[PDB]
Design a protein around this ligand. Structure first.
Ligand SMILES: Nc1ccc(C(=O)O)cc1
Ligand SMILES: Nc1ccc(C(=O)O)cc1
Ligand SMILES: Nc1ccc(C(=O)O)cc1
Ligand SMILES: Nc1ccc(C(=O)O)cc1
Ligand SMILES: Nc1ccc(C(=O)O)cc1
Ligand SMILES: [Ca+2]
Ligand SMILES: [Ca+2]
Ligand SMILES: [Ca+2]
Ligand SMILES: [Ca+2]
Ligand SMILES: [Ca+2]
Lengths: 376, 376, 376, 376, 376
C-alpha cells in the first residue's frame, strides 16, 4: 500500500501535480515495459515505411494507414475498460473490507474470560490465538505474500501461530478441502468448555463471544469466495483484446505519412506521435491499474500489506487478552469533574477551527408574529 | 468456475495477454459458433455481390451498402448492452452471496448441543443434516447441475441427504409448493425438543442456533427469488434484437465495394473486414458473457460449482458436529508465553514484506513550539 | 412474472434468439399499439408529401425534413432514458426484496409457542394469522391485483384472513390512516400474554418472536413507502417528452425525400424506414419496460404475483405452526453414521460435475528450499 | 409528495403521456419562469439583430453566431448534470429512508410495559411521547415546513409534544448544540426506572426497547448529517454555471441568421427555435428537478410531507400504547381450522390472477432412465 | 463544512444562481490560482506567436495549432474524471458515515450504570470518557485539524481527554502500532468490573453496552482503513496527467490564428478564448473538487469539522451520563390524555401543509358489484 493521504489533506495549488513525481507504486513503474515495446515497434515500422518500401509499396502502406486511422474508432475500448475497471475497483474495496481484525473479539475475550491465574491466561491466549490462526490460514490460502512467508503448516508451527498439538489435530482432521474453518469449531468448543468450567460467568457473554467469532468467520469466507470466484475470464480476455487490438492498430494508423502527399490529417509530421503516446498512457495505464488491483493480495506496491496485518493482529490480540486483562488505569475524577460545559483548549495552529455549533438548516427562518399563532 | 487469481496476483508484463491463451471458459468457446455463422453469411453475400449481380444490380447493392453503413450508428448497442450487462453482473454476484454455508451454524451446533453419547451424536448430526437438506432442496430447485445429480427426492434418500422417515414425512406434508422450507421448521422443533430435554443448556444458546439457521433460510429464499424473478424478458429481447440487428446490418454495410467506383470509405478493400470482426468479438462476446452469467447455476464453465459446494458442506458439517465435538487440541503455553512483543519470523522469500507500522496520515506533520501551546 | 431461467441455464448457440419468439411478457405486446400509431402517422405524412403538395410546398417540406434530421441529435434521449430506467429497475428489485415472507417467524412460532392442546393450536394459528393479515393489509393497499381480490375488509373476513371479531376491533380502532400496522401491536400483545401464561417458556424466545415480527413490519413499511413516494412526476414527464418529441420529429425527419433532388442522405429511398423503426423498437421499448416495472404490483405479465404469494404464505404458515408443531420424522442414524468422509454418489448425467476441491490461489506456488528457511 | 402509482399500475397505451397533463408537481411549474426569461432574451436579441444592426454589424453578429454554435459542444453539460443528479437522487432516497417511524418501538412498548392502571398508562404514554418528541425536534431542525409549524419549543408545548416540565428540563440542560438527543437519554432513564419498579418484567425486554429506540436515534442522526453536510457547494456552483453558460451561449448561437446569406445550417429559418427550446426543457428541467430534490424537507410539491408524518406518528403511537394495550380481539378458531390446505376465494375481477405455484427452474428437465442411475 | 440546505429548501427561480455568489468554499477559491497561471501562459504564447515569430515560423506555429486542435479530442478526460470523481465522492460520504457518535452508548451508560454516589458518577464518566478518548485517538491519527489541536498525548492530557494515569498506562502498553484500540479493551474491562461489583445489574445490559462500544470500534477501524488505503496513486497520477495534458495542449490548440489566413474554425478571433476558459472551469474545477474531497479531514472549507465534532461529543456525553442520570422531568398526563385522536394545531404559516392521509395506491379503484362476488 502507498499512502499519500497526508500529502492530499488540503486542496493546494498543484496538489496532484506534486504526486506526479512519485515512482514507487506509480503508473510509470507499471507502463515503462509495455511502453518501451510499443515505442520500439512503432519506430521499427516507421523506419520500414520510410527506408525499406518502394514507391508502390509506400502507396499501399499509406492506403492501409488511412484505413486503420479511419476505422480504429470502431473498437469500444472506453466501453469495455469502464465496465471492467469499475468491477475490479468495487471488488478491491470489498476484499479490503473482508480483512478480519480481532479487535472486537479481543476486547470481549479480555473482558469476559475470567482469571488472573495460569489457567485463565492460557484460556484467553488460546481463544484469541484460535482467532488469529483461522485468519492466517485463510490469508495464506488467498495471499502470495503470506504464502511465501508460511509455505507450510510446519512454518505456521515454527512461527508460533500453531502449536505442535494443533498441528497433529489438524493432520488428523484432514479432508480434501481447505481446513481454514477448523479453528472456529475449536473456538466454539473451547468457549463452551470455559463457560461450563465457570471461567465465562454467563451464557449471554458466551453468545457475545460466539457472535464476534462468527463475524470473523463470515469475513474469512468472503475472502475465500473472492479468491475462488475470479472476475470471469471472458471479461478479462475481452478487455485485454480491446486494449491490445487498439494499440496494434495504432502502430500503423498513427504513422506520420510523407508530408509531400499532403494526406488530410498528415499535413504536419512530428517524429513523435504525442497524442498516440498519451492515449497509450491513459488506456494501457487504466488496464495496468486493473491488473494490479484484480488480486490485491499479490506483491504489487499498491497491494494490501497482509503480512503487516498478520503481525499487528497477533501482537495486539495477545497484549489485549494477557497483559491488559483487569489491568485498568487508576479511576480518578477528570479535568471537568464539576464543569457543566467542558471547553477543551485550542492550540495556536488549531484556533481557527473553533466553530459555532450547527443548529439545523431551519434555525435562521424568520416569521411574522401573525405567521406563528396556532389556528383553531 | 475458472480461477486465475494465482496467475494475476501481480501486475507483470503482459499479465492478461498470458490469460488470452486459455480455452476452457474462454470467449473463444462462446463465440466460435456464432462467429462462424456470421463469417459464412458475410462471404456468401460478398460472393453474391461480386459474381452473381449485373452492373445495375451492383449499383443498387452499392447504394444499399452505403445506406446501411451511414445509418448503422443509429442502433444504441453500447447503450442497451451496458445496462443489461451491469444488471446481469450485479445479480450474478448477489446470487453467489446467497449460497448458504453451514459453517457458523455448525460451530454453534458442535458447541451448544451437549453429549458424547449416541443420543447426543444423533441429535447433532440430525440438526446439521436438516441445514444441509434445506440447502440441497433449494439448490436442486434452482440449479441444473444439482437437479441432474438428484433428479428426485428418492435420489436424495439414496445419496444420504434424507432418511426414508424424512421422505415419508415430506410426502405427507406435500402442498402444491416447493417444500424446501420444511427442514427449517423441523430444525426449530428439534432444537426446542433438545433444549427441553437438557441437551441445550440455555435458551440464549437456543436463540443463537435459531438465528444462524434463519440466516441460512433467508439466503435460500434469496436464491429462490433470483431463480423465480428472472431479468425481465423484455430487456433480454431488446438486447438480443440490438446485437443481432447490428450485425445483420453489418453483413451488408461492411461489404468492401468495388475499389474502381472509388466510393468514400471503400478506397482500400481488404478481403477480411478486420474492424467488423473485432466489433463482432466485443459486442457478441459481451452479450455471450451476459448469456453465460444470467443463470450462474447452469452447466457453463464459469457457472458456480454447486455440486462441489454441496459435497464439501456435507463432509465439513458432519465432521464439525460429530468428530470435532469437545475434541480440542491439548491447551499448552504458546511460543510467546512471556514475550511482551511477539515477532514471528520472515522467510527469505517474504523478508522484503516486513514493513514499519502505519501510524496515521498526521504522524509526520511538524509544528513550531509556538504553534503548539494552548491558548486561554 | 415470466420465468425463463431454465431456458437460459447454459450459454448455448442463439440462447436469447430462442427467447425472441416469446409473446406473453414480450416487448411486442408492449410496443404493437404505439408502433401501429407511429407507422400510420409516418405513412399518412409520406402520402401527403408525395400526393398532396405542390412543387413549392414539396421544396418547403424537404427543407423542413433536412432541418429536422440535422437537429434531432439535440434531444438527450439516451441521457434521460438511461437515468430513468436505472432508477426504475433499482426501485423494482427493492420492491421485490420488501415482499414479506412469514418463513422465519413461522419456524419460531412452531418451535417456541408450546402445547398440543386446543389452546396451544389456537394461539399459534392466531399469531401466524396476525403476521399474514398485516402482510395482506399492506398488499391490498399497494397492489391492484390484491385489491381486486379483496376490495374490502369484509372480503378479507369472507376469505378467512380476518375473523369477525378482528373486523369489529379494527372498525373500533379506525383512524384516518392506513390501519395496516394494527396486527403488529396485536401480535406483540398476544405474544406477551402467551409468555405470561407460560405457553412461551422464556423471555429470550419472546424477544426472538418479536424481532422476526418487527422485521416483517419494516418490510411492510418499505412497501408502503415505495407505493407512496413515487418516482418524481417531473422525471416521468421529462422522459415521456424526450421519447415522444424524438419520434414526432422522426415522423418528418425520417421521410424519404424524392430521389430526383438527390439530397445528401436521401440517395436511396426504401419505402420502409428500417433504422427509424429499429430506433422506435429500442427507445420506445426501453420506456415501455420502465412503464411496466414502475409499479411492479400492477397486473402486467412481468408484474409480481402478489396473489400467489398471499395464498402460499397462508397455506405454508398455517401448516408450519399447526400440523408440523412437535411433529418430527423419526430420528435414526444417517447413511454416513460411521463414514469419516461421506461421498454422496453422482448420476451419469452429473458425473462430469465431480470436481477437485479449490484449495486457494497460493496452492501451486513453488519455492526453493533456500527461499523457505526463516531468517534470524 | 405527488403520488401517481395508481395511474401507472399497468403498462397501458400512452401510460406516461396521460401523466403529461399534470400541473401540480409538474416540470412546467418548475420551468415556466426561467423559460419565459430565456424566451424574452432570445427574441430581444433576434429583434436587435434583424432591426437594429447595420450590414457590417450583421456580418459581425453572424460570425459570432457561427462561432458560438460551432464551439457550444465544448461545455460538458450532460457530463456534469449526470453526476450531480445521480448524487442528489441517491441522497434523496437516503433522506427518506432515515425518516423515523415509531411502529416497531410502539408495538414493543404496548407489549412489554405492563399495567392497565393510571401509572402504567402514564409510563407507556411518556415513553412513546419521548420517541415522538425526539423525532419532532430533529424534524423541526431539518425541515422548513415543520419549523414553520413549530417555530419554538413553546409551540411544541402548546401543541402537546412537550409538557411544561419537559420544557423546563430542556431549558436547564441547554448547551450550545441542537438538543434533539435529550429525549433518548430520557427514554433510557425512564425505561430503566420502569424495569426497576417491575413494570418491565425482564431485562431482555428492556434491551429490546432500548435497541428499537437506538435505531430511531441513528435515523435522526442521519437526518441531521444530511441536513448539515450539504452536497459540496463547489459541485452545485459548477452544475449551475454549466447549464446557464450553455443557454446564454444558445441565445446567440441558436439565432436564425438571414436565409439570404445561405449560411450552412441556417438554410431554413423557423421563427421559433424548436430544438433549442426542447434542450432548454430537458437540461433546465433536469437541473430544476435537482433543485427541488436537493432538500426534500422544503415546501416543494414533490418534497416529503413531514407534517403529515409527524401527526400520523403521534396519533398511531398513542393509540398503540394506550387503547390497544392488552386489548385483543376474541381468539376464536379461524375459517380453515380443520382444512389442511386452505384455498381463499378469488373474485370475478381477480380470478385470472390464480396461478400454478412456481416449483423452481429445474422442474421440467427430463432425463433418460440411464442418465439417472447413481454410478459406483 | 459549508451548509446551504436552508437556501436550497425550495425550487425557487434562480435557486442555484443565487449560490453562485458564495466565495468561501466556492469553486473560485479553488480555481483562481491555476486559472491565473493558465491565462498568463496562454497570453504569453499568443504574444510570442503574434509579435516574436517570422512568417515561416508563424506558418509552422499555425500547422502545430491545427494539429493540436484536431487531435486534442483523443485525451479521455471525461472518461478518467468521471471514474475518479465517482470513487472520491463515494469514499467521502463513507468517511463521513464512519465518524463515531457516542449518543447510543451514552444513553445506555446513563441508563444501565447505577448509582447517584461519587463511585457511580466516576464509573459513568470514566466509561463515556473511554469512548471519547478512543474516538479522539483515531481522529488525531487521521485528521490534520485534530492533530494540530492535539500534537501529542500530553496535549490530550492537558485538554482533559486523558488523565495522567491513563497516559502512564498507554506509555507502558506502547507497541510499534497506533494505540487507538486501547480504550476499547479498557472499556470492556471496566464494564466487566462494574457488572461484577453490582453497578450494572444484569449481563444482558453489559452485553448491550459492549455492542454499542464495539460499533464505535468498527467505525474507528473504518476511519483508519480509509486513512491508510488511499485511492491508488496510479489513478491519481492518471487523472492529473489527463487534465494537465489536456490544458497544456489547449495553450497551443486554442490560439486564435491570424484571421487573414482564413483557417477553418479561425474565421473569428476573440482575444479571449471563452470556450477554452469554460472548459478550464469545468474540468479543472472537477479535479479540484476531487482534490478537496479526497481527504475530507484536511483543513479545506468543505472538509469535515472534526474539532467541533470532538468538542460536542465530549460535552454531550458527559452531560448525558452525569447530570441526566436518573434526572427525568416530572411525569404528568399529556395534553391528549383522554383524546382518542390527537390533532396538534397548525400555525398560519403551516396551515397549507395539513394533508389528507395517504391510504394506498389502490384506494380509488372502483369495481362493479358483479366484479366483487367471490367465485366458488
Ligand atoms: N497522423 C498522425 C500520427 C500520430 C498522431 C499523434 O501524435 O497522435 C497524430 C496524427
Ligand atoms: N467498407 C469497409 C468494410 C469493412 C470494414 C472493416 O473491416 O471493418 C471497413 C470498411
Ligand atoms: N432519409 C432516411 C429516412 C429513413 C431512414 C431510416 O430507415 O432510418 C434513413 C434515412
Ligand atoms: N440555426 C438554428 C437555430 C435554432 C435551431 C433550433 O431550433 O434548435 C436550429 C438551428
Ligand atoms: N480557434 C479557437 C480558439 C479558442 C476558442 C475558444 O474560445 O474556446 C475557439 C476557437
Ligand atoms: Ca495485485
Ligand atoms: Ca450459466
Ligand atoms: Ca406494472
Ligand atoms: Ca425541496
Ligand atoms: Ca481535504
Amino acid at each position: 500500500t502507498i499512502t499519500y493521504t497526508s500529502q492530499v489533506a488540503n486542496a493546494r495549488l498543484g496538489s496532484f501535480s506534486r504526486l506526479l513525481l512519485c515512482w514507487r507504486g506509480s503508473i510509470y513503474k507499471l507502463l515503462y515495459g509495455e511502453f518501451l515495446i510499443f515505442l520500439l515497434c512503432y519506430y521499427i515500422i516507421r523506419f520500414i515505411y520510410r527506408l525499406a518500401l518502394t514507391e508502390e509499396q509506400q502507396l499501399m502502406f499509406e492506403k492501409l494507414t488511412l484505413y486503420c486511422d479511419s476505422y480504429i474508432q470502431l473498437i469500444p475500448i472506453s466501453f469495455v475498460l469502464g465496465f471492467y475497471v469499475t468491477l475490479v475497483v468495487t471488488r478491491w474495496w470489498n476484499q479490503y473490507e473482508n480483512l478480519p481484525w480481532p479487535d472486537r473479539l479481543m476486547s470481549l475475550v479480555s473482558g469476559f474470560v475470567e482469571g488472573k491465574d495460569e489457567q485463565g491466561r492460557l484460556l484467553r491466549r488460546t481463544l484469541i490465538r484460535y482467532a488469529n490462526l483461522g485468519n492466517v490460514l485463510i490469508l495464506r490460502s488467498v495471499s502470495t505474500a503470506v504464502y511465501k512467508r508460511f509455505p507450510s503448516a510446519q512454518h505456521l508451527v515454527q512461527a508460533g501461530f500453531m502449536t505442535p498439538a494443533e498441528h497433529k489435530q489438524l493432520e488428523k482432521l484432514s479432508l480434501p478441502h481447505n481446513m481454514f474453518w477448523v479453528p472456529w469449531v475449536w473456538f466454539a468448543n473451547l468457549s463452551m468448555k470455559a463457560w461450563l468450567g465457570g471461567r465465562i460467568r454467563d451464557p449471554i457473554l458466551l453468545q457475545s463471544l460466539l457472535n464476534e467469532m462468527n463475524t470473523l468467520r463470515t469475513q474469512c469466507g468472503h475472502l475465500y469466495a473472492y479468491d475462488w470466484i475470479s472476475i470471469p475470464l471472458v471479461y478479462t480476455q475481452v478487455v485485454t483484446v480491446a486494449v491490445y487490438s487498439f494499440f496494434l492498430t495504432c502502430l500503423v494508423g498513427r504513422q506520420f505519412l510523407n508530408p509531400a502527399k499532403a494526406y488530410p490529417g498528415h499535413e504536419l509530421d512530428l517524429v513523435v506521435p504525442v497524442f498516440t503516446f498519451l492515449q497509450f498512457f491513459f488506456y494501457v495505464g487504466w488496464l495496468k491499474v486493473a491488473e494490479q488491483l484484480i488480486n490485491p493480495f499479490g506483491e504489487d506496491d499498491d497491494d494490501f500489506e497482509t503480512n503487516w496485518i498478520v503481525d499487528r493482529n497477533l501482537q495486539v490480540s495477545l497484549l489485549a487478552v494477557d497483559e491488559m486483562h483487569q489491568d485498568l488505569p487508576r479511576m480518578e475524577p477528570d479535568m471537568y469533574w464539576n464543569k457543566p460545559e467542558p471547553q477543551p483548549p485550542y492550540t495556536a495552529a488549531s484556533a481557527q477551527f473553533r466553530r459555532a455549533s450547527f443548529m439545523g438548516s431551519t434555525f435562521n427562518i424568520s416569521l411574522n408574529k401573525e405567521e406563528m399563532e396556532f389556528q383553531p
